Amino acid sequence: TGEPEYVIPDVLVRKHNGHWTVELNSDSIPRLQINQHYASMCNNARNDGDSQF
Amino acid sequence: QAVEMHESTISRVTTQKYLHSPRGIFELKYFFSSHVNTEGGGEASSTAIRALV
Amino acid sequence: GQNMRVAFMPWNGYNFEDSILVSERVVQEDRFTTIHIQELACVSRDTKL
DNA sequence: TTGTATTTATTGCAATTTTCGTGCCAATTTCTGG
DNA sequence: CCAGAAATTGGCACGAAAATTGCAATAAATACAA
Predict the structure, then answer these.
(1) Positions of E strands within C1-49
(2) How far is CA C35 from the centre of its chain?
(3) Which of B12, B17, B38, C28 satisfies CB 3.0 to 4.6 Å to B42 for a cystine?
């Protein structure tokens, strides 16, 4: 009773047109984003504490 | 020297990173090894010597 | 299918309610024998060990 | 004509530990004569 | 056949080379109001 354990690679290397192509694993590359809804209220007409925050 | 950085950056970047190749899954640190002098001015990596043995 | 020599009559309750009585010569001649083919797969993967 | 607040541009050293190869020797396996 | 005499290996030590981490906020270019 058991099952083997795997590791998700960080870098992929393959051979295309006789040349070695190297890239990052697109399924595991971290990324972020800026929330436009909260950042779109950065207007001086609002409170100054809110603006500096 | 090849990428024009310090050795500390190379050491930190290649910690617990995994590379997938048509041969298998390896570590980025797995490709660094010592050498043993070969007659004629050549060098032999310890990994190659272990494989030969 | 196959061409069969057939009679329409009751036979001792063995063709009761859409039952069919078949001769042994039909079996001996392999007239309704079929071939079935099945596939099995073994996958060898790569692990961390 | 200029002085100030904002936006990007900064991913390298120097101790310090860990590891590399390799020689010396003492406790085990093989080589040779009556 | 058997006992006295020769190779084998792993621990320990040596210098030297290499991998590791503690340094945590700075400086230069650019736009605007007097």
Answers:
(1) none
(2) 9
(3) B38
For the CA of A39 and the C1' of E32, the distance in angstroms is 24
Residue A9 CB neighbour total at 10 angstroms: 19
What is the CA angle B37-B41-B43, rounded to 5? 40
Tell whether B29 is within 8 A of chain A (Cβ): no
- Output phi, psi for B42, to 5 deg: -80, 175
Question: What approach was used to elucidate this structure?
Answer: cryo-EM
The torsion region of residue C22 among left (phi > 0), alpha (psi -120 to 50) and beta comes to beta
Q: Residue B24 and residue C46: Cα distance in Å, rounded?
A: 7
Amino acid letter, B13: V
CB-closest option in A9, A14, A15 to B18 = A9
